[PDB]
Ligand SMILES: Nc1nc2c(ncn2[C@@H]2O[C@H](COP(=O)(O)OP(=O)(O)NP(=O)(O)O)[C@@H](O)[C@H]2O)c(=O)[nH]1
Ligand SMILES: [Cl-]
Ligand SMILES: [Mg+2]
């Protein structure tokens with residue numbers, strides 16, 4: 153605990169010549185990464201070598217801070233160090249409160265509507281950017297899945313159970329029949345969940361973070377979490393209304409897209425385990441297949 157922060161304090165002061173760390177605490181973490189609040193003022197996202205890295209994320213912030221017109225704040229990178237083994241991005245903390253189901257349920261109907269409009273407006277503005285200058289950041293989700301399926305076939309597929317194989321083949325049958333990858337491509341946040349959305353003191357959208365998965369990809373991508381029915385997200389109705397306010401988009405296919413990504417999740421989890429040599433993820437994905445198969 154107190155040892156991570158010393159190591160990171162050292163790396164920050166070593167790589168950014170004039171920077172002095174008066175305070176530093178862990179503010180969040182993924183499975184590959186750790187984030188730190190420094191001097192009660194700066195966020196520092198960090199990562200050590202992992203199927204990389206923070207170069208794309210930086211190029212995305214730089215593209216967006218040049219091209220977006222919006223009052224919604226996003227990270228603006230002041231400090232970056234990027235190497236094969238280590239990557240650090242520092243920027244000023246955007247202040248606010250993260251959106252949650254609980255907060256949402258306390259908002260008046262009109263407060264909720266204004267938030268949904270704020271979100272639809274943000275997404276419309278980003279999805280509308282001429283992305284020529286960030287064109288290297290393309291992502292083909294369908295092709296990625298095919299390549300991941302090939303990796304499964306080359307590694308553990310033959311040891312899976314019949315129930316597990318059927319789940320996967322049935323997913324691939326669905327992938328092959330769907331049309332939801334054939335639509336408009338644009339620059340998407342691509343991890344647009346309510347834990348990345350910041351509210352100000354009037355419960356209006358004041359900022360957005362973590363454009364780490366951003367790319368030129370299906371327009372439907374940015375509604376996947378807004379449409380999710382779970383304890384972490386607000387609800388299907390929230391995403392529906394946002395889709396209506398956003399306009400010019402096939403809502404039923406947005407939902408199909410979301411449903412297909414949800415079906416893929418256990419396989420994604422297995423694949424992450426294969427690629428990063430973590431048996432624990434392989435087993436969680438496989439077990440999740442049994443859970444889904446037996447649910448009614
Ligand atoms: N309030 C605030 N919190 C921030 C800001 N930047 C990051 N955070 C906090 O730090 C956490 C992690 O930041 P995030 O960019 O989501 O990183 P990640 O998923 O954990 N890393 P990765 O993008 O490499 O997978 C966020 O959940 C949030 O608590 C910011 O500008 N303001
Ligand atoms: Cl296993
Ligand atoms: Mg995040």
Ligand SMILES: [Mg+2]
Nearest residue numbers: 362363364365
């Ligand atoms: Mg992230």
